[PDB]
């Protein structure tokens, strides 16, 4: 008989059932960055890719497969049909439309909603116990959308949120202080993007409040202008885009970090977008970034950060804005 | 005084001298894939990126920097001037020109050679003891070019060669056999691309010659058509391009593998392009892929693979072709 | 002291206040053609350029500056912030979005309206007494939009309209007759583009009605097929695009003509888009091209052209169509 | 009979013979900028355009024709056949190849030479008494090439040379001093581009030597670093390109200035490239920029500028380099 059968004796006619499977939807810049990061942190035994452009999809899948010798993720598959995603522990959404200059924030959101109206029901059909990690912008809204469409409990629907923002913050802090960002601690909360809130009260190195050493920290009479740090966290993503076209690497790594906490059940604390109704004064179904304990069941627990009146108010306003957009949305 | 001076007491006014530094020249798809691969295998304490397009360059540098919290590479720099590459242990060249409407292999090659005539001397100026790892196509020729321009000894000029090709081969073999490519062993040597030679004699799983189990292996009377594997190895790179535009991921992972072997002085054996004159019947200054022992000094040693006459002849002809191209090239 | 202070004695610490300032918004082909035309007719003492693409903007500004020796416009500035436009007598809008694969007239329009929702308020903030000259397509609609957003009186909001169309008409007539277009007189009114109306009644050379010499002029039984002239006026803009990519030169010269009439208070008569409600049977807030008297305050007066019923009706229908579009548009 | 014949009585069956005709070869960015500048300075009664891309050509020609009402140049024609250029007083060459990254300076020059080998003989056939104004880069070489191919006397072959460079210089001087460049005087000579020489000895405002007021002017111990001015004159064209893609406006205006001096026989002095053999120490057939008297017969006379040893030497070196390139060139 065949060379394979001459060389190999078979014990098991094998039920191929994935044990730690991850699916990425959208193989654009972000989606693929997430993919290579995940492959190189060995977070999955099966990686599935899904997109509507079949060329790009198959191409990216083959390019990865070819690097298999250098990886420890034994099944990489792709497809337009969602059966390829069956039994994922984790499904990351990076599919999205590109905002165009004229396009209202609203029109964009609605386009993306229609996209989600296609994706989420399919994902849920084939992996009804997965965690959803939403990356597509504008992310607090789309995480709400995904939650509405899936009918999943709030713990299994997570948005990438201010994870990345907080990483940029810590990087900038580190640059200012001559210390690695792993040792510079600081939190960015609320609405991802322009409206995010830097919590100065808890900025520290080695458990030393920077705010008590420098009481004017992050105010206007701040001679060292630390507000600039946060301003930069916001404008960075702009500059980077202007410069290179888009953001991929940093967000891919942030998402991989999150995935590591979930897949490995670590119970680390991350600033991610979660359904915050009831807390921080918020009284609508909106998603904002707070410090969340991530693990095998998604968001198990939430850190109640003490805020100033102004911080609480910034959040309230973000929530009112977000809600205003969300109620003009059809499911 | 400043918040920094109030928070941090300084012992050392520090000589910043990189200890394990890597430079990637060319931040296109390939270059950047190499970069993220290097960043995620913790192979470097400083990574420098160099390109002529300053926008793209700075953007990519920033996108990486923003992911610093999730990395263990504490300095990432970019620049148009080569002083940013000073003291690299390893410099990867991915820079190249894109072939255009009505451009002969020869014209494209000459343009790339002129590119190298600029890059290599600068590189050598600022890192005179580095190893050069050449990735740009056509790679055997361009590695020969780098070697000529740098005046480095043949051990410090390595070309990517058939590393990736051999990886694709092992992936395909693995697919045919239901085994991981790590355990399917097989070698592709000589000229990277179309003219490469699959050494069937040494195809094995667990030290079991496939060629002795299936003597017709890889011939034309081979009922299982194993030639197809090799054909595919060649056409893969085509299909992928056709599908997605280009190749990045696999080649990046291959290069990172090589880099690991060098930075860590492993003395693993890899099929790379080395100045092969004196061996295999070859009598011209050409580079071909053979099994090379890689370590802190680049190529320390070479494996002398037993070949058939036909194999030896394919090699001879590729070497004659390469020389034929090279002798029509001005330095 | 400095060479400057040694060479030059200063009388005045000078309030830099522009006296005849022009702003062009949008530095694409059209915008820049307008700019060189304005620079070479000596219509301005300060020219400001504004765009969202900062690279293109600064480059064009510098390329112009470098030609200063050959010009009599002593200050050329560019910028992304609208403070560089402060105190313009005249602001030309050429900014616009490009229509894409599967984009309705309506979607494109809405994108452009959103663009205007940003530009116009800024413009008005820094130059509250300027005249607005709108060039971006679809121009009658977009002039209506600028008028709505700015709250300027109808005399200060002028659209390019059928100025250029009428120029093409006169060129074609001139070709047919062997006379310069300066001496061939003829009017194209109403909706710029396909729906425009050629007023044959007033086609003349030296005050000689072509319509009375050739009563069948411009009808279907016209053996000389003068309709073709008008048809061509419409198809010209198509052919040119097909051939070269776009239109710049002619439109630029047209806009500069208009500008001359305004900056110099000439009170020449030009066919431009003006808020025509109350006249010609029109009963909606729409803009159409009629003969307008242009001068230092924009459109001071309007020529009441005698029309046939059919002409009046074409106008009525274009106005109803325009309104139909506008009522589906959000401010 | 016809409407034309009913309206117009003909005296003259007219020999159409152009009296002040200009031809532009190459309707790229530069060529068209030259064209619009010429049209707006009313330097021609007939303007002819020539290119190998027939679409682009016809398109640009129509776009100009359509602006005829606003111009005082009554015949604008285009074509691929050179009969359209017959009887030009002046033929401007802007045709050229784009230098590619890999491309040696030499390869580019040779490509352009082959282009000229097509253009010049045709131009000369149809306008044997014209002046040739060479703009294409590298311009001192191509002006030599045009002269060799045409067999015209040295007065009728002019290169754009350092006209533009000197305009940039005067603009920068003007910026530093708060004076219009028309009143800041200063000369840039020799090889256009990087190797150009700023003649500090004759830098002045109102006949006041800046070099005698500030003896260190343009040296290294110059505390005001005036060398930077010249450095910038060189890097400007680079920055502008980087920023916008290319240079058009400034060069178009420079060329139009030159054209004005020729067409109108003014005998102004301009820094243009002329066959400098015999002077400034140069002993080969090379072209460099010196101050030339331009008029109806092209370069009638030359200004003998007194130079330092170093300046003379810079020129000598430029000439030796240029010659070295030119003697490796086949006609
Ligand atoms: N929250 C965050 O921190 C960040 C979020 N993002 C977002 O990621 C998203 C995509 O970013 P990029 O990768 O740069 O875009 P990428 O544009 O280049 O492509 C997105 C992909 O989505 C796909 N897609 C569209 N409709 C689909 C459908 N119905 N089903 C499956 N796939 C579909 C496209 O085919 C495409 O491949 C955007 O929404 C962007 O804003 C980007 C950076 C950071
Ligand atoms: N050995 C292998 O198996 C493979 C080899 N390659 C080759 O590697 C090369 C890179 O491919 P891609 O990343 O897709 O191309 P990439 O084309 O998209 O761009 C190459 C980069 O090189 C840069 N560059 C050019 N000249 C430079 C200079 N003088 N100094 C600094 N930077 C310079 C460009 O700016 C560009 O960013 C190609 O030549 C390609 O054929 C590609 C895939 C696999
Ligand atoms: N009335 C007429 O006879 C004619 C009208 N037009 C119209 O004029 C417009 C310009 O055409 P082109 O110059 O070829 O287009 P151009 O497309 O090449 O680019 C338009 C410019 O507008 C800019 N822009 C867009 N949004 C902006 C903003 N929010 N702020 C500042 N700048 C912004 C872009 O950056 C771009 O540089 C088009 O809409 C076109 O249809 C064009 C030809 C003749
Ligand atoms: N000396 C100076 O001060 C300056 C010189 N230049 C030069 O002007 C030249 C063109 O510049 P651009 O307008 O930006 O290029 P443009 O590239 O966009 O196009 C040049 C034109 O030459 C044409 N052409 C090529 N072969 C031809 C032939 N055999 N017959 C007729 N036409 C032919 C092309 O079709 C094209 O339209 C280049 O050589 C450039 O270096 C540019 C700026 C300043």
Numbering used by the authors:
A (entry chain A), B (entry chain H), C (entry chain H), D (entry chain A): 1 to 331
The authors write:
In humans, lactate dehydrogenase (hLDH) occurs as homotetramers or heterotetramers predominantly comprising subunits encoded by the LDH-A (or LDH-M, muscle) and LDH-B (or LDH-H, heart) genes that assemble to form hLDH-1 (B4), hLDH-2 (AB3), hLDH-3 (A2B2), hLDH-4 (A3B) and hLDH-5 (A4).
We investigated this possibility using the cofactor NADH as a proof-of-principle ligand and measured a data set from a crystal that had been soaked with NADH to 2.9 Å resolution. In contrast to the apo structure, the side chain of Arg98 engages in contacts with the NADH phosphates and appears to be more ordered, with the density being better resolved. The presence of NADH displaces at least seven water molecules, although a full analysis of the water-interaction network is hampered by the moderate resolution of the NADH binary-complex structure. In addition to the active-site loop and helix αD movements, a number of residues display rotamer changes upon binding of NADH, including residues Val25, Ile53, Glu54, Lys56, Ile115, Asn137, Ser160, Leu164, Thr247, Ile251, Ile325, Glu328 and Gln330. Our ligand-bound structure reveals NADH bound in an almost identical fashion to that seen previously in the ternary complex in the open conformation, implying that the presence or absence of oxamate does not have a significant impact on the NADH conformation. The binding of NADH only triggers small-scale local changes, indicating that the mobility of the active-site loop is hardly restricted by the presence of bound NADH.
